[PDB]
Design a protein around this nucleic acid. Structure first.
Lengths: 45, 159, 121, 125, 260, 133, 160, 69
RNA sequence: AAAACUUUCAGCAACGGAUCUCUUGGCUCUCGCAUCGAUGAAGAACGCAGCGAAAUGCGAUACGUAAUGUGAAUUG
RNA sequence: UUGAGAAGCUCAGACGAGUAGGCAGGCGUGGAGGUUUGUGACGAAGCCUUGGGCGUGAGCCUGGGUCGAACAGCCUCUAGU
RNA sequence: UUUCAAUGGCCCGUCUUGAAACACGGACCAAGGAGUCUAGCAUCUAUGCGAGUGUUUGGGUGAUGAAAACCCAUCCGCGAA
RNA sequence: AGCUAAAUAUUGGCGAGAGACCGAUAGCGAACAAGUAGAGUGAUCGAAAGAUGAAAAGAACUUUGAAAAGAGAGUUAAAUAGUACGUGAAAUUGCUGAAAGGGAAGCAUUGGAAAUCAG
């Protein structure tokens, strides 16, 4: 959106929509063995 | 995010912050000033006492209109209040800072509030005064002249 | 003929300390009642041509050399015959590569550089 | 220097025309050079990029990569080449777009229209 | 010029006196942030500028045709002085002769490589190299206004007939080609500075007498025009002062800077 | 004044020459020429060829070969048909004045040429134009 | 000729003058002293002499009126010997009957130029620390890398 | 800036651009074939008429004429 | 007379949005051309997309149909 | 003796408040023509700084920091300076 | 640079008056913000020409920007009574 | 009683080319949803609002919290670029450090002390 107020407003609606749905799945879910934080050391060649 | 203070390094410290908090900035500054430098557990006891009215937060800088209480005698002042909303926010941040320290692997028993600061958030005619709060909890040659040295050598030889 | 300065303090504009909107740059007071303009007791000074410095040592640095702004090596060679009169001053926007070329060439010509150690170390 | 009063040298007009171009015009805008071998074989210096063409990335961090064009993204002036991707945080791959001028066509997706286009531009097939 | 209506399209009048407001006109109505705001003033935001520019400003300047012809004659004479070309900034340090005159085969060139080859032969290509190396992006708002690049000036090629010379030379950066019959001061003294490096063809050089005439014979191509006369016959005043005629009558020269 | 308001380089060269002659000779003529060089255009009225001819052959005549000198323009006078033989040194000669003097008569000189012929201004008539405008 | 040229370059504009705070410098390749004036401007002075560098060999450059019209052949060059006394003798025999002021400027330049050659050779023999440039992009990046590296090192826990 | 110009600025329909203006382009000769075959398109009509042996005008010319030689 | 408080200076963090650079905009000038509507105009209203609110496009054939050109897209 | 940017150099003496008014020389900003073999991603501009230096002054130069794409000296032109 | 000591130091502008003081303006900062363009007249200076002077109503012409530059037929303006 | 091309006019219409113009408080009111939001019964009135990055690569994953968010982590040349997004001034605010303070303060002069520069 070339209009700065509108692109900001849509982002805030997008951010709320994303955060709400991320925790909708998070509360539904509540894994540790598989999902581990990847770091630079783990990504070292 | 970068904080105001030199500490919060991984060495002995943890971080916590909350931005655009819907609390009064003046009350938050008084709470932050009071609990600054306390041990983490001792600060939790103090915050709980403020909720229970067993202790009070001295209003040192922003003291206009604060009545005198005997509970402020512990801090050497007479004007002290019991801000509940500000204590709730600071209690939450101290809980979060404690959790971050636990994940890091610090020593909880030696944790003090090394740094705690309150800043004004953008004002939001009833423009409110939101508060930014950040907390850091941490574990607790010259020469000699020719005459001078020759005198020194002569003195040393005499000894 | 040592470098003598008739004055070291600058001439701050009247009331520039009290107000931030009033800059420190000197402004001649035009008010017909300005006490400092009238040179009353204890008032701060005003720039005068008598404060001017000796023409022989004017524009000279404490080392006795006059500063000459240098942008590249070509300007350095311009100071070949005036190395006892002029000191090269490398410009701020000259990059690090050209500074090392300027400084090295100045060393060969025996020309002092006022800021030889900048962006070069 | 330009001497025609029908062409404008204005920066404002040229940038508006470039970023206001329709897809049929961006199709010409998204042109790539023909490789040395293709150039001496077809007698054509450059051609518009078309899907399934075989190209080699010449410039950028992907300098040297080769592959077919899986999509010409005319609305962004981007070429999505197979296997030239980027690994997001979550593990999905986002294809990396390359400007058509930064690749070189090593093999063309010849059709009757492309052959007609080749001979049209003073070429041979 | 600005729009003659810019700063007037609003509706506003002064709210009056005694209301603790600067008496500048304020915008009427309500419900928008513009309401109550000032208007109609150089000091006001969205107001009128002071003394809006007008298109009937004087843009063009009259110059007597005699003074223009004087300056063009002075520009050509300066072009024939090697020292003024160097001060101008031309790299003519290896030019065989000033004024540089080439044969009439140049007027029939067809390729830019032929023109470049000739420039190298007469060693005038150093001035072209200076121009190409000088091309910079313009500093300031000029590049937002179709003034995107700047560069130095190269040699000026003066021809008599155009049989391909203009197109052969015109893409070489800095080179300006002109007919000898319409010599331009903007090209002969660029920036108001005298001494541009000029390359004449043989026919252009040979017609210069018809274009300008002499100080005693009229120009053929300028009716009733005579080359201007000088205030001084000899420009070497130092030689005149140190001449035998004057040094034999002047009294004994006193001392130079004297002892205190 | 001590310098000319004119930015002409050749006039500045003339002033440079006559600064030297004024201070290095004892000629009030050279001092006069320098002062008139500093004068503005208004205070340097043109002198006609007819007035030069009249003044040279005036009263006892006795012009002989004395050179007429004016710091200013010498204009032509189409009214007189016959031009005497004259030798004039001036700042400027109009094209008609220069032609008439040369074709029927003697010599035109610039003020620097005079400085080489009469460095002290000997045998010179220092004429002036009428400043009545 | 020369006087008018000086009036044009010395008082209208010249592409060799660096306007300074109390003195102008001549970027001309032939100004012996380096500062432009009636006695130093090669443009203004038709008969001129100068001493300049060339690949370790000092050369005397001379020009006159008879060659002023031909820029290619205007300047003439001779070598100056390594010997200082012989170099002065060459300058004196080349600039004979030239103004003593002009010769004095040439001999002053030759002396300075000789000092330049001596100091350049001495610094070539001598060893000095090489001066490396500084890259703002590298310095900013490596700084941020080390702040992140220290925060992820956990030195106290590793030592303990 | 007009409502009718802002209308097509924000529109998606392309402007009706026509490319017709090339100054210095003199009108080509129809009419006489003999004149057309001998007309050089660069020259002016006064230059062309004089070269062909024709009078552009039978009356005086209201200005100075070019003198090339 | 230590602390608090007040002030000053520096550092850091806020608050704010100046500066600098930019610019599919405006403004001005010049040039070419002459074309609304009862065969329903300009304007207004309402609708139409797989997922659309504005703007854009279009009109129940509704972000278009035919035809011609280009020659392989559209793209969230 | 080199000290001729003659618009330069040099010697000597006197003088120094200043309203109205008069006269002169300078500093700075946007843009234009010229020029500097001009500066620049090895960092332009800007900004910040208890860094340094120059000017009687208007102002200028520079170190360090931040920063990320352009800008300046000189001669002239111009002004919404 | 900060701070201390000793000494001195009335708040700036505006207006009024012989003069003050009143009185009016000033919470703070940033950005903007006021002798401009044009026609006429006059003076002075410069420049060109000079008993002349003024090309740009217009025409010619201008291939490289052609709104430039360059050229000037007949008039006309002012001056020369 | 009547018609009549061309030279002439042209802030509109359909286009085009330019500029010693303005550069986001400027330039049109409108560089962006601009005669829009909004106001008024109505005629009318009428704004504010441009900039992440080369690429969205727009921060997976773990942990704390009811959540918003935080913290480790990650991407990037750079998060001193996290959409409250280029640069980021001043006013102003909090924090730390240093110092001063008996009913003003700022300032000037001279030095001392402390700190720091040329050196």
């Amino acid at each position: 959106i070339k209009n700065k107020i509108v692109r900001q407003q849509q982002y805030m609606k997008a951010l709320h929509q994303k955060n709400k749905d991320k925790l909708e799945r998070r509360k539904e879910r509540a894994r540790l063995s598989e999902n581990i934080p990847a770091t630079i050391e783990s990504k070292r060649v | 995010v970068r904080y105001s203070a030199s500490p919060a390094l991984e060495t002995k410290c943890a971080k916590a912050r909350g931005a655009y908090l819907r609390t009064h900035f003046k009350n938050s500054r008084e709470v932050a000033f009071t609990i600054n430098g306390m041990s983490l557990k001792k600060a939790f006891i103090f915050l709980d006492n403020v909720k229970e009215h067993k202790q009070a937060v001295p209003f040192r800088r922003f003291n206009g209109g604060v009545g005198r209480t005997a509970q402020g005698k512990e801090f050497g002042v007479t004007q002290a209040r019991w801000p509940v909303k500000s204590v709730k926010f600071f209690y939450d941040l101290l809980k979060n800072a404690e959790a971050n320290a636990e994940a890091k692997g610090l020593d909880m028993d030696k944790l003090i509030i090394k740094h705690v600061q309150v800043n004004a958030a953008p004002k939001q005619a009833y423009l409110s005064s939101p508060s930014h709060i950040e907390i850091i909890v941490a574990e607790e040659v010259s020469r000699v002249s020719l005459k001078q040295g020759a005198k020194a050598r002569n003195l040393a030889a005499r000894k | 003929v040592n470098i003598i300065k008739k004055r070291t303090k600058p001439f701050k504009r009247h009331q520039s300390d009290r107000f931030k909107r009033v800059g420190e740059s000197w402004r001649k007071p035009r008010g017909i009642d300005s006490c400092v303009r009238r040179r009353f007791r204890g008032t701060i000074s005003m720039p005068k041509i008598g404060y001017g410095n000796n023409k022989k040592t004017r524009y000279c640095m404490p080392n006795g050399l006059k500063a000459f702004l240098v942008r590249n090596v070509s300007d350095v060679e311009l100071l070949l015959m005036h190395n006892k009169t002029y000191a090269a001053e490398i410009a701020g926007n000259v990059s690090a590569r050209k500074r090392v070329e300027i400084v090295e060439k100045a060393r060969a010509l025996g020309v002092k550089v006022t800021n030889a150690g900048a962006k070069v170390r | 220097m330009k001497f025609s009063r029908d062409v404008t040298s204005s920066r404002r007009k040229q940038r508006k025309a470039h970023f206001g171009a329709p897809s049929s015009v961006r199709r010409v805008l998204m042109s790539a050079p023909l490789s040395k071998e293709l150039r001496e074989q077809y007698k054509i210096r450059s051609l518009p990029v078309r899907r399934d063409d075989q190209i080699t990335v010449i410039r950028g961090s992907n300098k040297g990569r080769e592959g077919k064009i899986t999509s010409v993204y005319r609305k962004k002036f981007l070429l999505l080449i197979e296997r030239v991707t980027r690994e997001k945080a979550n593990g999905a791959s986002a294809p990396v777009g390359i400007d058509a001028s930064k690749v070189v066509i090593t093999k063309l997706h010849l059709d009757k229209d492309r052959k007609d286009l080749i001979v049209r531009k003073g070429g041979k097939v | 010029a600005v729009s003659e209506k810019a700063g007037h399209q609003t509706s506003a009048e002064s709210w009056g006196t005694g209301r603790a407001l600067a008496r500048i006109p304020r915008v009427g109505g309500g419900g928008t942030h513009r309401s109550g705001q000032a208007a109609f003033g150089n000091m006001c935001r969205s107001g009128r500028m002071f003394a809006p520019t007008k298109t009937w400003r004087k843009w063009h300047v009259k110059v007597n045709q005699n003074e223009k012809r004087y300056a063009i004659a002075s520009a050509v004479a300066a072009s024939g002085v090697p020292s003024l070309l160097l001060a101008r900034g031309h790299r003519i340090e290896e030019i065989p002769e000033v004024p540089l005159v080439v044969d009439d085969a140049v007027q029939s060139f067809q390729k830019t490589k032929e023109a470049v080859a000739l420039l190298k032969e007469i060693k005038a290509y150093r001035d072209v190299i200076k121009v190409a190396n000088s091309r910079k992006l313009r500093a300031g708002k000029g590049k937002l206004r179709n003034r995107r690049h700047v560069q130095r000036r190269g040699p000026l090629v003066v021809f008599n007939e155009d049989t391909g010379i203009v197109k052969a030379f015109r893409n070489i950066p800095g080179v300006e080609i002109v007919n000898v019959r319409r010599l331009n001061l903007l090209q002969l003294a660029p920036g108001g500075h005298l001494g541009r490096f000029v390359i004449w063809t043989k026919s252009a050089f040979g017609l210069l007498d018809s274009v300008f005439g002499s100080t005693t014979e009229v120009a053929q191509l300028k009716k009733n025009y005579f080359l201007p006369e000088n205030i001084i016959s000899n420009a070497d005043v130092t030689r005149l002062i140190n001449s035998d005629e004057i040094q034999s009558i002047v009294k004994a020269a006193g001392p130079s800077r004297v002892k205190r | 004044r001590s310098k000319p308001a004119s930015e002409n380089v050749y006039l500045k060269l003339l002033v440079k020459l006559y600064r030297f002659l004024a201070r290095r000779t004892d000629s009030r003529f050279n001092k006069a020429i320098l002062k008139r060089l500093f004068q503005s255009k208004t205070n340097r009225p043109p002198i006609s060829i007819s007035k030069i001819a009249a003044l040279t052959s005036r009263k006892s005549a006795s012009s002989q070969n004395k050179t007429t000198v004016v710091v200013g323009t010498v204009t032509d006078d189409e009214r007189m048909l016959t031009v005497p033989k004259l030798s004039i040194a001036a700042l400027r000669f109009t094209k008609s004045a220069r032609a008439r003097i040369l074709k029927a008569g003697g010599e035109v000189l610039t003020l620097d040429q005079l400085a080489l012929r009469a460095p002290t201004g000997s045998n010179t008539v220092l004429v002036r134009g009428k400043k009545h405008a | 000729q020369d006087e008018v040229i000086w009036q044009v370059v010395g008082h209208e504009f010249c592409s060799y003058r660096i306007k300074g705070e109390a003195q102008n410098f001549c970027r001309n390749e032939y100004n012996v002293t380096g500062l432009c004036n009636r006695q130093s401007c090669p443009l203004a002075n038709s008969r001129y002499a100068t001493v300049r560098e060339d690949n370790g060999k000092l050369y005397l450059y001379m020009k006159t009126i008879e060659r002023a019209h031909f820029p290619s052949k205007l300047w003439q060059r001779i070598k100056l010997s390594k010997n200082y006394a012989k170099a002065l003798e060459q300058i004196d025999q080349q600039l004979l009957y030239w103004p003593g002021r002009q010769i004095h400027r040439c001999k002053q330049r030759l002396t300075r130029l000789t000092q330049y050659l001596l100091k350049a050779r001495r610094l070539a023999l001598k060893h000095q620390p090489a001066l490396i440039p500084i890259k703002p992009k590298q310095a900013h990046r490596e700084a941020s890398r080390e702040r992140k590296a220290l925060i992820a090192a956990k030195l106290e826990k590793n030592i303990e | 800036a007009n409502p009718r110009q802002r209308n097509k600025q924000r529109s998606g329909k392309p402007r009706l651009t026509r490319r017709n203006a090339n100054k210095k382009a003199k009108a080509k000769i129809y009419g006489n074939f003999v004149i057309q075959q001998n007309w050089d398109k660069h020259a002016t009509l006064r230059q062309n008429y004089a070269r062909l042996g024709l009078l552009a005008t039978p009356n005086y010319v209201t200005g100075g004429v070019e003198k090339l030689y």
